[PDB]
């Protein structure tokens, strides 16, 4: 019930029940039809929250494993919990990335959409890269990288540097460099080029794009400072 | 593995995985032995959050369903408020089932008995929040019955200053104002708890309580 499922998701969005919210949009996606800009948001929001909950628990629990170096019984316990959250994390990611391969990207009849979903794909392969270890990690990093890259060229091609989507993928791509394969110079020139070029053209912001673009632009300069 | 469980409870806590944290402390509790002060609180923290997320979602949908008196939409909001409600009761029930089989029975200390009576009054109050129809009547009764019993023990056993004594006062008066709708009463139970502990003058745990007591009183007043 495309209509009743999307309603149920907006409901579960307000109730802050995001597993419910994501279960509604999965179904809407698995129906095969291209998501409206509104459905694409809901799914994006549902899984960002669904996955974000595990990233948070992982980071906390991992920083604890690092903190209990030299405390065996404790580190052991931290680690087994980390590993337990990671599996949840991956499954979430594997679900999302699959919807993305089987439904979202395939049916993206638009440039913006192609760019949005491939960014998202680079995102979730990043979340997997964050918790992947040695062996499997190399190909995960590359799967994110390669998704970000195609998304980058299409954004450079199709969009003004002030486009909320273009900026959010530049921000995210620079983060991937900085934190994923830790290429600090690259992350910096990417993030700094994206900042400069849209900063040079504020006057291209619509009434629909000012807060989104200027938000991410504020997220870019912040990362530039941190780095 | 009991300290094992308690540890993972502190872990799932720092991680904000209260489904985890709660499944640990339920197993702990289910082993049979009286709970320490640390275990009892982890239990309360775990489920307060498990229940809390439902109560929170419940409220959101509730007004959505009410601010919608639009049919098929209110119907969808109705059935949703309901699924959450069901989830909310199963939670309250699991706790109230723990409170009957293990917790209150083992309660050797007065503070113990009162901490578990308060809690038992808390969780019948969460049920009452969503108890509609013929249902609500007995539900509030059970809540009030445990708060009151808890209240009298504490009155004649603990000090006005005791964090556990204060916290029951705090919640019993929240029952009055919100469940019974007795603001005047809720305010006398609260004011008296403050005044009597203010005379007698566990800081950390019992100063936040007067904080919540006084915070509530200024609102209502």
């Amino acid at each position: 019930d495309k209509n009743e499922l999307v309603q149920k998701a907006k409901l579960a969005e307000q109730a802050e029940r995001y597993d419910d919210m994501a279960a509604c949009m999965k179904s809407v996606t698995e129906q095969g039809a291209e998501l409206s800009n509104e459905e694409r948001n809901l799914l994006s929001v549902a899984y960002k929250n669904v996955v974000g909950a595990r990233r948070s628990s992982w980071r906390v629990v991992s920083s604890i494993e690092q903190k209990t170096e030299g405390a065996e019984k404790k580190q052991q316990m931290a680690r087994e919990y980390r590993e337990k959250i990671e599996t949840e994390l991956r499954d979430i990611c594997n679900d999302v990335l699959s919807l993305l391969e089987k439904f979202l990207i395939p049916n993206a009849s638009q440039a913006e959409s192609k760019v949005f979903y491939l960014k998202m794909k680079g995102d979730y392969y990043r979340y997997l890269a964050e918790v992947a270890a040695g062996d499997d990690k190399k190909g995960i990093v590359d799967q994110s990288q390669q998704a970000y890259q195609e998304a980058f060229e299409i954004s450079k091609k199709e969009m003004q540097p002030t486009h909320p989507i273009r900026l959010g993928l530049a921000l995210n791509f620079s983060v991937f460099y900085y934190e994923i394969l830790n290429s600090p110079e690259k992350a910096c020139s990417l993030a700094k080029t994206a900042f400069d070029e849209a900063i040079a053209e504020l006057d291209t912001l619509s009434e629909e794009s000012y807060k989104d673009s200027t938000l991410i632009m504020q997220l870019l300069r912040d990362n530039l400072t941190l780095w | 593995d009991k300290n094992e469980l308690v540890q993972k409870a502190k872990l799932a806590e720092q991680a904000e995985r209260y489904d985890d944290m709660a499944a640990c402390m339920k197993s702990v509790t289910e082993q049979g032995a009286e709970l320490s002060n640390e275990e009892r609180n982890l239990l309360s923290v775990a489920y307060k959050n498990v229940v809390g997320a439902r109560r929170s979602s419940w409220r959101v949908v509730s007004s959505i369903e009410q601010k919608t008196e639009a049919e098929k939409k209110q119907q969808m909001a109705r059935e949703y408020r309901e699924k959450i409600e069901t989830e909310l009761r199963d939670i309250c029930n699991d706790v109230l089932s723990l409170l009957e089989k293990f917790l209150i029975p083992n309660a050797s200390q007065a503070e113990s008995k009162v901490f578990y009576l308060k809690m038992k009054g808390d969780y019948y109050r969460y049920l009452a929040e969503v108890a509609a129809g013929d249902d609500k009547k007995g539900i509030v009764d059970q809540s009030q019955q445990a708060y009151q019993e808890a209240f009298e023990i504490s009155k004649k056993e603990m000090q006005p200053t005791h964090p556990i004594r204060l916290g029951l006062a705090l919640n019993f008066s929240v029952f009055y104002y919100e469940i019974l709708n007795s603001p005047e009463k809720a305010c006398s139970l609260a004011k008296t708890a403050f005044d009597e502990a203010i005379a007698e003058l566990s800081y950390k745990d019992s100063t936040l309580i007067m904080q919540l007591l006084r915070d509530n009183l200024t609102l209502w007043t």
Binding site: N172, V175, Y178, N223 | G167, Y177, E178, L212, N216
Partner: peptide
């Protein structure tokens, strides 16, 4: 309603 007892990424909506 009564009281009782470091690198940033895109906004995502």
């Amino acid at each position: 309603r009564s009281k009782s007892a470091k690198a940033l990424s895109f906004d995502n909506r």
